[PDB]
Design a protein around this ligand. Structure first.
Ligand SMILES: *Cc1c(COP(=O)(O)O)cnc(C)c1O
Ligand SMILES: *Cc1c(COP(=O)(O)O)cnc(C)c1O
Ligand SMILES: CC(=O)Nc1ccc2c(c1)C=CC2=O
Lengths: 426, 428
């Protein structure tokens, strides 16, 4: 298929994330290649190389086509593509589970693999709910969160997504009605935590778990909060006997300047989800981790088993490329790398602070955000970044990047300048 | 790691499907290789070649390590592992969408890629809900199905699983309350269809959709039903204006003897799900298809869009191997192949009918079922099939197989013989 034939087929037959068929002011750009930190896109019939400033939606932490990750995939392909995980186990699953148990916040001892972040979140909720039935408290079945969050697109995951971001308006009422605390602020205010505790207190007997994104709220608006709020949640969840779930699907594997965002706070959740960067952006894969107590309580319970089992659970190919991805991250000084990227983003985005349309410029690890005072027009922003050799995808009033860890200073400089110039045009 | 080191790590850290941690009656068996129809398993410290009679849970239709599928994967890997599908498109997605639109039941013109069967089912439900909201009828929000079904493990998918049966039984208090018709019988009975219609009639104003597995109900009990029921369902859904959704996640890609099981009836659903065999069992991938009308109605509605978008949506690598798997199936006489597999299964399983613990033997394309009179003890059945060179995984009271299409006549008879012996052991 030629690029023009790809466009014709796509327009007629392909749905895209949160998109229409037949409407679409877009239309999407044909990608023909991806290597390192660069994508090859078709603009006016011609292939152009542009920086993947988004890491292809958080995924490509080591960049596309990393030789070590290509090799791990092809190596596994020669031995065993996939076997069913019902009644069988294998080396890739074992090696990955061992790695993930060792590097996650302490006490997360057991690993349940799935095929996407939304599924790992449902699994997390199912673990939490079965946990309390296993304790003789089936009333503990609702979830609590703070606003601004995003947890996935499946129906349970939607119920804890921000009611505006997730447009709960169009969903009244098919969704579970969950407990929402106000938006967690940027700066630390103990009054916020006190009010969170009081709100939780009156719901405690009906709550299975608090579920939040730690430090960084991604898809719901790229907000950062003081990690000390996670210490308070841990404390509140402990005292009131409610499980704590950290959704680290966007934040894990070094992205926020710590290995997991939880590490900023020195706290361990009872249940943890990981996903987007797990395979270094090659293949869909996720995992849900829980403590020994959670695993045993579920297992000793009436049901005697966690009632979940995706067809492709613990896929050898995705597990093997993930092993190589995690070892590649751990085998380098990743902390210095992220610090430098963060500094590169801080220096490059600085001039944007003075722009008349800009309300905030903020950085956390390898994440850089320019927040504006009005929606960013995509028909203006997108070609503008392309002219500058950068792939950027703004949403709402935000211009932002989550660049691959392998971006050089020159590349960060190029990413930031394109971001600044999108903000100038606003 | 060594096989015993894998076991040690696995017992301590790995959750398995529908299992406990630390209370597993049987240890899992270490798999170290898979090629063609054969797995290499570790048994008492020794590697053994066994047939993958399960197709690694319905997935490995072409067997493992097929040269055309390995190559399609390495070829895509060299060019583009993955890009974000928000604002971008690519050849693997376009080619696969083109294929799926052409081979599925007529009128299925749009394609939404996701990462798993359960997710594709939630996308189908979302499509149905948003469609009716687009039409100004937001009261049409419930789903109807028949008993015996399975649709995945995510919470909306659970709500249409068989409520007893039924693996998701102890959740009913927290699941959306759906409409359940009685178990669809094997043989065609016009009275079943009339009662289904009558039950649906009272909920029409609140039903978004009928959702069923066509012809074969898989994980809910390997039950077959007459394809004329699907014709009835189509006619009933048309007349009461309820969307029809076919979950072909288990049945797709030739498994039941037709390309899609809906084809046994000439029926086109409004929405369709595909998954397990989509990538030939290489990588996780699913798709949800819908009509142009359902798409345009969602698009012109308040949202202006289907409110769903998974991270790895239309993953280039998974799309590329699926393209190759579908072409491989289509470029051969798959129909004659499945017919021969079914005859082999029938001939091979026939002797089981006379066994004292057997209540039914049934075949439908490349699916063979010995239904026993008691639940099948895995601690007895697993080793017994291994001793005969076959990987079999019974569940509940069923000893069954869905072998790869590449199995020779002699491999099929080796599979069935091992199934007969397992069934013989259940009776003693
Ligand atoms: C992306 C994301 C999810 C959902 O992951 P998918 O793989 O897209 O289903 C859940 N939680 C968080 C925090 C995410 O960033
Ligand atoms: C296996 C299956 C599902 C769920 O698929 P996963 O990929 O395991 O989530 C849904 N529907 C049917 C009919 C299935 O056989
Ligand atoms: C448009 C929106 O609300 N979210 C998303 C925007 C873009 C993507 C995804 C989700 C998932 C992969 C993408 O590329």
């Amino acid at each position: 298929l030629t690029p023009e034939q790809i466009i014709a087929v796509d327009g007629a037959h392909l749905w895209h994330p949160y998109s229409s068929i037949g409407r679409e002011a877009v239309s999407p750009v044909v990608a023909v290649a991806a290597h390192g930190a660069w994508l090859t896109l078709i603009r006016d019939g011609q292939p152009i190389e542009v920086l993947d400033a988004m890491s292809s939606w958080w995924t490509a932490i080591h960049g596309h086509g990393h030789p070590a990750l290509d090799q791990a995939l092809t190596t596994q392909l020669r031995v065993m593509n996939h076997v069913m995980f019902g009644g069988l186990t294998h080396e890739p699953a074992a090696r990955l589970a061992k790695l993930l148990v060792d590097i996650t916040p302490a006490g997360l001892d057991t690993v349940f693999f799935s095929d996407s972040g939304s599924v790992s979140v449902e699994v997390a909720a199912k673990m939490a709910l079965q946990y309390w039935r296993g304790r003789g408290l089936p009333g503990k079945r609702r979830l609590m969160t703070w606003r601004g969050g995003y947890h996935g697109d499946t129906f349970l995951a939607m119920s804890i997504c921000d009611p505006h971001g997730g447009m709960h308006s169009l969903w009244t009422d098919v969704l579970a009605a969950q407990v929402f605390a106000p938006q967690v602020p940027r700066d630390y205010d103990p009054a916020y935590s006190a009010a969170f505790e009081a709100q939780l207190a009156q719901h405690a007997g009906e709550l299975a778990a608090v579920v939040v994104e730690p430090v960084v709220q991604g898809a719901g608006g790229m907000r950062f909060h003081d990690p000390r709020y996670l210490h308070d949640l841990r404390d509140i969840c402990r005292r009131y006997e409610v499980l704590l779930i950290f959704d680290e699907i966007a934040t894990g594997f070094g992205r926020t300047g710590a290995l997991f965002a939880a590490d900023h706070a020195g706290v361990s959740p009872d249940i943890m989800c990981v996903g987007k960067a797990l395979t270094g952006g090659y293949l869909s894969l996720a995992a849900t981790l829980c403590t020994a107590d959670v695993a045993h309580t579920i297992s000793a319970g009436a049901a005697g088993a966690l009632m979940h089992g995706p067809t492709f659970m613990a896929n050898p190919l995705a597990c093997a490329v993930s092993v190589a991805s995690v070892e590649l991250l751990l085998g380098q000084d990743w902390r210095t790398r992220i610090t430098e990227l963060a500094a590169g983003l801080t220096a490059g985005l600085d001039t944007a602070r003075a722009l008349p349309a800009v309300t905030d410029v903020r950085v956390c690890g390898a994440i850089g955000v320019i927040e504006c005072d009005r929606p960013v027009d995509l028909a203006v922003a997108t070609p503008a970044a392309l002219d500058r050799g950068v792939w950027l995808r703004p949403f709402r009033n935000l211009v932002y990047a989550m660049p691959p860890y392998i971006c050089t200073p020159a590349e960060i400089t190029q990413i930031t300048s394109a971001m600044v110039e999108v903000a100038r045009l606003v």
